[PDB]
Design a protein around this nucleic acid. Structure first.
Lengths: 149, 129, 141
RNA sequence: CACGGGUGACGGGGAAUCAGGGUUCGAUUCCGGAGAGGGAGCCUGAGAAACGGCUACCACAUCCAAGGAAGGCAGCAGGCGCGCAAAUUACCCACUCCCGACCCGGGGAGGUAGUGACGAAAAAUAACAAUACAGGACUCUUUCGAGGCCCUGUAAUUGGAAUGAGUCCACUUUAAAUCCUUUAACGAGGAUCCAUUGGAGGGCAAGUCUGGUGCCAGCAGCCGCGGUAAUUCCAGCUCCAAUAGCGUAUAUUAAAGUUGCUGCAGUUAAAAAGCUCGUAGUUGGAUCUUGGGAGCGGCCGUCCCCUGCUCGGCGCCGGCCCGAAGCGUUUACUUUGAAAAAAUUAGAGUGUUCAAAGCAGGCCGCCUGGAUACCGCAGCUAGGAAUAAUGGAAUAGGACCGCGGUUCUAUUUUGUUGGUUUUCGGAACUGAGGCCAUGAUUAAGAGGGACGGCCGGGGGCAUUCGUAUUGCGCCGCUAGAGGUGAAAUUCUUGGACCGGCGCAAGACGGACCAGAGCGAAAGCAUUUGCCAAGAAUGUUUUCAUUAAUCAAGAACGAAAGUCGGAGGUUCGAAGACGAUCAGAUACCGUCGUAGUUCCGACCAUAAACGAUGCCGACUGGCGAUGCGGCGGCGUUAUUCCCAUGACCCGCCGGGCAGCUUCCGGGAAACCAAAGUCUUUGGGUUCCGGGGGGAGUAUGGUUGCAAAGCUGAAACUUAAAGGAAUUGA
RNA sequence: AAGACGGUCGAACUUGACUAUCUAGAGGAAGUAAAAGUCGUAACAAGGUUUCCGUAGGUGAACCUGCGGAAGGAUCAUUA
RNA sequence: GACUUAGAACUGGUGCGGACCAGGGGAAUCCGACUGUUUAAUUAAAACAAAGCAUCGCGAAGGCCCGCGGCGGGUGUUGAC
RNA sequence: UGACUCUCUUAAGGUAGCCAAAUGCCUCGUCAUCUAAUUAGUGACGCGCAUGAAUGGAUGAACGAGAUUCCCACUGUCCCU
RNA sequence: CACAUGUUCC
């Protein structure tokens, strides 16, 4: 049940019951963290560290091996980005639609599509206001959002 | 979305009772529902239930007997005084011989007879007979 | 009701307040226009002055001539085609005589065979028309 | 829901009416506010902006000698007006109290009467016996009929027995009276001492009685009757409903589950905005303490504990037991207690002879009563910790245990007199510590985001192709060619039509094309390229409640229409012409403006339909189909097979659908939702109250205009309408 | 004491504006209710041009036409 | 080192933009949009012009018109905006 | 009155609009208003001698030393000098 | 190719 689509699909991850570390994994908590610190140093959003670690490094979940999750580890060392990843990719998507709308202003379908992200951006903006991860006077401004990638 | 949890559990087992299923599964497990199921079992309205406690909101399999007519839910949870508790069961229960209105009190969750014994009111939860 | 929230009392009360105005009985009793158009103005009975006697033709299949009187009020000045109640009573009524006029019983709706008359004569010259028919009273002349 | 407007609004206690909930009213005896015709100002007085006090203006009104003076009944009466609507210009301080210098005077407050079918309570208009009869339970009699051991009723048949209404005296009553009660005497056999009000086709009880009337008079709330046999009109008989009451009008309540919180309806009867986003508003996943022990009764039922840290006595040998005071997350909610005017409401007692009423009363001085209940909603206080909220420490200014130094300070003390510093009690600050089990629930068949391979007439830009149509050029041959039901309007030796070769223009995208795909909807179909977007699937990827519906507001929005340009092939509103017809100003045919085609702006309306709002769960199967993924014999391509393509067999998620049946529902048509509904409650918007008037007038707002949004009343009407059956 | 001066409260008067209600009005366009009126026959049977909706134009009149939609249509169906 | 603005009190026979400077106003009808121009010496206007609107001709050996004349002239130091 | 119908005629028989108008003879047309009294003015009626659509029709915000009607104020225009 | 229309009660 998407909030900006009429689709009611059911496709998501399903963790196994056991929270114990896999028997094939010999990497300790700090060795996973320095691998995480290596991926975060070269530039990578916490979604992608979890992706490639289960592909090549063979870890099941970071929360079961270490004491914390991926974003929480980066927050402890201060390697987390200035603004969260889901708002960042929404602003990046909103910039691309607005950049496309500059040339193709006849694209009424793309014009309608633009409000949906700005609707979705503001929902994430006021939620992060209450969690105090953003400044209380932060506001998504469309003209100056192109500076952020 | 799923606003109330007890309402979905009670209607799911009422649909199974109308069809007459031997046992029924409800998808959420809550403390209120477990307390709700224990109220009906001491009176023998249902067969013996069990919960499947995974690492999420668990699933409850409730064995069913044929003694259930309808188990409804009252939303929202209106507070019930001791003065009009007779008025609540007059227009909700079928008769005064049977029918049970369960409602949460500070002493716990129990039917309307036991709330009269302890002389404690509270907010209504549902009705079942 | 549709909404069943625990604090939707102002939503439920406003809906019942607004939907009451769509009821014919509530809107009639709570508007100044219905009382303005009523010649009685909420009065059960009223006195008027006879200026002429009018014969009213009848409706579909049942066809006859109904005897009516054009009654002009003293309190408002309006004119009412009031109906003479019983048989052979138009000989009792005379010109320029005060009459006690009430409704007939349908409360603002034309009654039966007579088109557009909601009013009947009760007393004439402070003498009851019912006793005039019964012969219990005689008109002062 | 501010402000403003209306109020046919003094407010409340309360009244009517209801199973439950509600609706309407409250001018009116108790409380509180305002006023004395409308304002305004003031003297005195403790207390007035007093008016049975003044001062002015306004409006009304009075006497006058014409100079002047003087008034406020929304106080009791009373008069006029107004009305549908409301009493005596009576008596008295004898009760209640009030005021004064006061036992003594005063009170149109008040009490007592008069009028008074407001209304309520009690309750007359008769009863008994005998004769004829119509008969009922019994015995005889196969019926007929009999006696009445027991009766039931009828009849201006007869007979006495008892009282009131009234006449009427004595006493009582009361300030004087009056009424009631008691008391004598009268006072009723058609007990003439005479009960009325509506109706008699249905609802709705009760004549197919009699005569007159003849769609006239009229009856009738509604359906309906009357036009010469009226069960409905007018009279008579009879009967039916209530009974000193009944009828009618108006307004309200219940019936109304036709305002629906309880508790309505929204596919077709009235209805879900064309669709989407969207702040208020409303509703919101799971998860943080259960259990044990001492006792009693026949595994079950019941009580206590899992609370911590100044002052005294069962006191006992610094410690223990007990009592008292204080602090210990906050609420909503539940229980309790106080504070909670009376009158009224329910209700205890009480023979006002009963009852409405009232608070008394009963026993040979006493015994007693004059209770009790709630006061919601609001506020205070006290037990509880389920449910519903808010919060704790994760840059630690986190919680405890000792602290070390700094600043001021209550000081008890220096025997007293005086300075100082500290042990000392308090407050604050700064640094090193020790200790925590050192502080992170979950990752929702919730949501958001990332990623992988796809997928799709989704959208925009550019490019390309294909006939066909129209027009033109050339050639050939021609007398007809178009068009129709039939003809004509039209072209045609100046060569029409037709065939061939080309050229140019502008539309459109057939067959493939499907109960198929995409899109929020409108809508989307030649090839290719570019740009951005999107659903589903897969995921042991990330965040962790970020969610659902939404007024105000905003985006898109078929066709038609409008304004600027470009272009106008075909079709084609208007218009012209020829047919048809009684007429065509239509249907048919030949032309043809606007338009239909492209770009930039308006317009925001559709049978914008699934006539079916959106989110979440459950409730039978069956075969298909689209996408993605998974598994598997096998046939077939690259060929050189693994893997990828095309098939075949299944499984998974939703995507459009279909078939089927007694799930279930609905008035039915029919519906896997239109079910999980009188066994009525998952959440949240919009919207309807018989049919017209009418989407009209007016007002507001938008638009260049057309028109778009909001949106009545007067008045009229007893049906309109939906589904289904049978005839025609 | 009368009285005068200044200030304050301030009834009320004149003038002007705004607004509420009622209301005349030449002329004009509506609705409702009769008619045994006149003209035609739009719709209900394929109603003799299938019906209906949105938008424009025209016509004595119901109506007609154009464009785009819906079946509430007389088709749930038609084939390699 | 300034000029300006605001406020208060007092006061003159209510007089104070005291001379000078200095818009009468409102409601309608017809016409022309308007600014402008016009009969020097009777007509300042509704007349003319004006932007806007709609036609016609012309792709240069051409449209238009001038010149008695010529490979003469202008529009044209122009080309369908 | 008359939608309607019959009929003669032309290339069409004036459509949308407007009017006693700067356009109407009859005419001082009729009605309402403005007045005590109006051949003036305004608003309607249209059988229009002889209105009417770029020989442009209707409209008319702003403006005009353009042409008329009425009202307040103002005054020797006048009473009456 | 045209087939326009026929007041009321059971």
């Amino acid at each position: 049940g998407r909030m900006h689509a009429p689709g009611k699909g059911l496709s998501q991850s399903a963790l196994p019951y056991r929270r114990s570390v896999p028997t094939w994994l010999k990497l300790t908590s700090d060795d996973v963290k320095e691998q995480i610190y290596k991926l975060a140093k070269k530039g990578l959003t916490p979604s992608q560290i979890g992706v490639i670690l289960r592909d090549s490094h063979g870890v099941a979940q970071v929360r079961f091996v270490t004491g914390n999750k991926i974003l929480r580890i980066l927050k402890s060392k201060g390697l987390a980005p200035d603004l969260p990843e889901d708002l960042y990719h929404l602003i990046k998507k909103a910039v691309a639609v607005r950049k496309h709308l500059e040339r193709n202003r006849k694209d009424k379908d793309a014009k309608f599509r633009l409000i949906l992200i700005e609707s979705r951006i503001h929902r994430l903006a006021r939620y992060y206001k209450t969690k105090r991860v953003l400044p209380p006077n932060w506001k998504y401004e469309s003209s100056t959002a192109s500076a952020l990638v | 979305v799923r606003m109330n949890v007890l309402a979905d559990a009670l209607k799911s087992i009422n649909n199974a009772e109308k069809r007459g299923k031997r046992q029924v599964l409800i998808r959420p497990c809550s403390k209120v529902i477990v307390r709700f199921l224990t109220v009906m079992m001491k009176h023998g309205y249902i067969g013996e239930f069990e919960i499947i406690d995974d690492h999420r909101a668990g699933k409850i399999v409730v064995n069913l007997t044929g003694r259930l007519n309808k188990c409804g839910v009252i939303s929202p949870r209106f507070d019930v005084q001791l003065k009009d508790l007779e008025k609540w069961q007059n227009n909700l229960l079928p008769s005064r011989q049977f029918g049970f209105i369960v409602l949460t009190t500070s002493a716990g969750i129990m039917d309307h007879e036991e709330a009269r014994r302890k002389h404690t009111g509270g907010k209504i939860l549902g009705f079942f007979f | 009701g549709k909404c069943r929230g625990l604090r939707t009392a102002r939503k439920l009360r406003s809906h019942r307040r607004d939907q009451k105005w769509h009821d014919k009985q509530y809107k009639k009793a709570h508007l100044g226009t219905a009382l303005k158009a009523n010649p009685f103005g909420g009065a059960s009975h009223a006195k008027g002055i006879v200026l002429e006697k009018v014969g009213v033709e009848a409706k579909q299949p049942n066809s006859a001539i109904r005897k009516c009187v054009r009654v002009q009020l003293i309190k408002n000045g309006k004119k009412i085609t009031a109906f003479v109640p019983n048989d052979g009573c138009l000989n009792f009524i005379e010109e320029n005589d005060e009459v006690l006029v009430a409704g007939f019983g349908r409360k603002g709706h034309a009654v039966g065979d007579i088109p557009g008359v909601r009013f009947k004569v009760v007393k004439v010259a402070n003498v009851s028309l019912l006793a005039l028919y019964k012969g219990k009273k005689e008109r002062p002349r």
